[PDB]
Amino acid sequence: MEHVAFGSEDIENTLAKMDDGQLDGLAFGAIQLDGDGNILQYNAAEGDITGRDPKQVIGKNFFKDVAPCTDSPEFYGKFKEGVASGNLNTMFEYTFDYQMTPTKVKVHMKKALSGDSYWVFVKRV
Numbered sequence: 001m002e003h004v005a006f007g008s009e010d011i012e013n014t015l016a017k018m019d020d021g022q023l024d025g026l027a028f029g030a031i032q033l034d035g036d037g038n039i040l041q042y043n044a045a046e047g048d049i050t051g052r053d054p055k056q057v058i059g060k061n062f063f064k065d066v067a068p069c070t071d072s073p074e075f076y077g078k079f080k081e082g083v084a085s086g087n088l089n090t091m092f093e094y095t096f097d098y099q100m101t102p103t104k105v106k107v108h109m110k111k112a113l114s115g116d117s118y119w120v121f122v123k124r125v
Ligand SMILES: *C(=O)/C=C\c1ccc(O)cc1
Pocket: 046, 050, 052, 066, 067, 068, 069, 070, 095, 096, 097, 098, 099
């Protein structure tokens, strides 16, 4: 495993060194999005939670195509505000229920170290 704890204060620094293969060693789901919500990275733990095949969701838009549960002011709304402000660091619980058994998760969204990229971290609660 890669020893990084969910919710760690310097998580963006740690994950900046990881390739897709290293991301797959995290104890929690991790998705990297561009400013438009397009999926840049999607790790194995997330695929384990949602059932989606990581290779197949990369390049798709998270909010429009992949995870319409999140297209709401409570999730998407927060993301868009963060993108516009250039700053984002928020944690909340949510339920994923599209084409799957309803699953309650903890979500942490944080801006990445790189300019126009954003992390969504996910773990079961
Ligand atoms: C609602 O959010 C439904 C599905 C979904 C699929 C993949 C990921 O990663 C999150 C959510």
